[PDB]
Design a protein around this ligand. Structure first.
Ligand SMILES: Cc1cc2nc3c(=O)[nH]c(=O)nc-3n(C[C@H](O)[C@H](O)[C@H](O)COP(=O)(O)OP(=O)(O)OC[C@H]3O[C@@H](n4cnc5c(N)ncnc54)[C@H](O)[C@@H]3O)c2cc1C
Ligand SMILES: C[C@@H](NC(=O)c1cc([N+](=O)[O-])cc(C(F)(F)F)c1)c1ccccc1
Length: 426
């Protein structure tokens, strides 16, 4: 039934060995969880999707890992209610292709479509449209959670099980196995964006452009950010913003199949782009850490609360002065947060950087951790396998609430991961 397998996060770091169950048979999955429960816990079980998380949340050294990628059936698509009912193992690429002809758009899209719905919910992922759409959890209408008791629990965001539902969103698999979910899609009439580009010359300008009220004009916005240049060029950005195009906005040639699947003159208006172009160059650089890992690069993502913009500038300054130089930097202003205790996004200044691994780096990122922490920010479990339980708990003031919910639902700790042990969420 199971295969012992060396697992790592996306960037190939922090390996551990788990027994991997890989079956399309939901009943075998139910049986396996039950068997772990009847052994009284042991080293537990965790779900795994496509392994795009950079962290150690989708592995469980010495225990069970359940590869959910074979549960990939799309059960129903409904264009009136905009609801799709899909297995947790279906990936966003797969769903995007299946839903487009219905005029439905995946409501939150990360930098790669090679993630499962289960992984999307478990890490409450965010996209270029976060300030307008919230995160992936905001669009979950129901989900079926296989819990430690071996029961499949139907959860809703306002029902009697709302508490468990919202601990599952962003819960990193630690409430049980998401089997299946119903997602509310976004109506669209085309598969293209109409984009506006702007290039800033400085950090202050980047921040000004994000605080001048223009963000409200775009459903989607992100920026490519300079973290190496000496000030005042430090913080300058290439900002890509836009919204889904209506068919009248499409160039003549493309109006045929509008829902088709798949230095400083970087300034433009009303350019029409498909998903790949609009998100460029995220797709071509996505394999980077995996291609040169585990020894090449350390990704590092954090968000600082909106009101702490000065503290945010200081961290950027510290990064530039450090000697650790990152070219791949993505920046965004997050919008309002949701109600999941462990959700990563909060409104504020979000950036992912990617350091070359060098002498002094580990010590340096521990320094960043402290600053992010004190300034009221957080790290993201999808991007971390290095921080401490103390640091993480301090970054998530709702962690004890979350742990309490996890205790109600998994008293024997049937669910466990390397991450849960490292960060003391277990
Ligand atoms: C190139 C690249 C770009 C990215 N861009 C973004 C981005 O723009 N925004 C963003 O928020 N993230 C981004 N990520 C991170 C990624 O979206 C998340 O880590 C996501 O959870 C990965 O999904 P997965 O199916 O691969 O999950 P895995 O990596 O396999 O697992 C991640 C977590 O989900 C849990 N899980 C998976 N399936 C289930 C299930 N069926 N039931 C219960 N729990 C489950 C696992 O236990 C684990 O805790 C990116 C990653 C890469 C490699
Ligand atoms: C790891 C991966 N991240 C992203 O694509 C990404 C990160 C972020 N982020 O939160 O830093 C946001 C986005 C967004 F919002 F635009 F969808 C995408 C990546 C890929 C290629 C270059 C740099 C980062």
């Amino acid at each position: 039934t199971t295969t012992a397998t060396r697992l790592t996060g996306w960037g190939r770091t922090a390996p551990s060995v788990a027994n991997v169950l890989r079956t399309p048979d939901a009943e075998m999955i139910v049986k396996a969880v039950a068997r772990v429960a009847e052994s009284g816990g042991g080293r537990g079980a965790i779900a795994r999707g496509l392994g795009r998380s950079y962290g150690d949340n989708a592995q469980n050294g010495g225990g069970l890992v359940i590869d959910m990628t074979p549960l990939n059936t799309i059960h129903s698509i409904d264009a009136d209610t905009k609801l799709v009912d899909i297995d947790a193992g279906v990936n966003l690429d797969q769903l995007m292709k299946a839903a487009l002809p219905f005029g439905l758009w995946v409501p939150v899209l990360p930098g790669t479509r090679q993630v499962t719905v289960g992984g999307a919910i478990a890490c409450d992922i965010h996209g270029k449209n976060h300030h307008s759409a919230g995160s992936f959890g905001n669009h979950v209408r129901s989900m079926d959670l296989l819990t430690a008791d071996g029961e499949i629990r139907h959860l809703t965001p306002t029902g009697e099980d709302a508490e468990l539902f919202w601990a599952t969103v962003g819960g990193n698999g630690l409430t049980g196995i998401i089997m299946r979910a119903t997602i509310e899609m976004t109506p669209t009439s085309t598969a293209y964006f109409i984009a506006d580009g702007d290039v800033t010359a400085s950090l202050d300008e980047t921040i000004a452009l994000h605080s001048d009220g223009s963000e409200a004009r775009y459903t989607y916005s992100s920026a490519w950010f300079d973290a190496i240049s000496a000030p005042p060029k430090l913080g300058r950005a290439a900002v890509s913003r836009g919204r889904l195009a209506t068919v009248e906005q499409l160039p003549a040639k493309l109006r045929s199949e509008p829902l088709k699947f798949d230095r400083k003159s970087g300034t433009y208006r009303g350019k029409v782009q498909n998903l790949t172009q609009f998100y460029h160059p995220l797709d071509m650089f996505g394999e980077w850490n995996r291609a040169y890992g585990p020894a090449g690069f350390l990704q590092y993502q954090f968000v600082i609360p909106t009101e702490a913009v000065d503290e945010f500038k200081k961290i950027i300054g510290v990064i530039q002065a450090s000697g650790h130089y990152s070219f791949l930097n993505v920046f965004k202003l997050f919008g309002p947060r949701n109600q999941a205790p462990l959700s990563f996004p909060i409104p504020g200044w979000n950036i992912c950087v990617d350091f070359p691994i060098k002498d002094g780096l580990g010590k340096f990122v521990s320094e960043l951790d402290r600053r992010v922490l004190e300034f009221g920010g957080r790290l993201y479990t999808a991007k971390d396998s290095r921080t401490t339980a103390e640091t993480f708990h301090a970054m998530y003031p709702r962690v004890d609430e979350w742990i309490s919910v996890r205790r109600k639902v998994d008293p024997l700790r049937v669910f466990a991961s390397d991450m849960a042990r490292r960060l003391e969420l277990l």
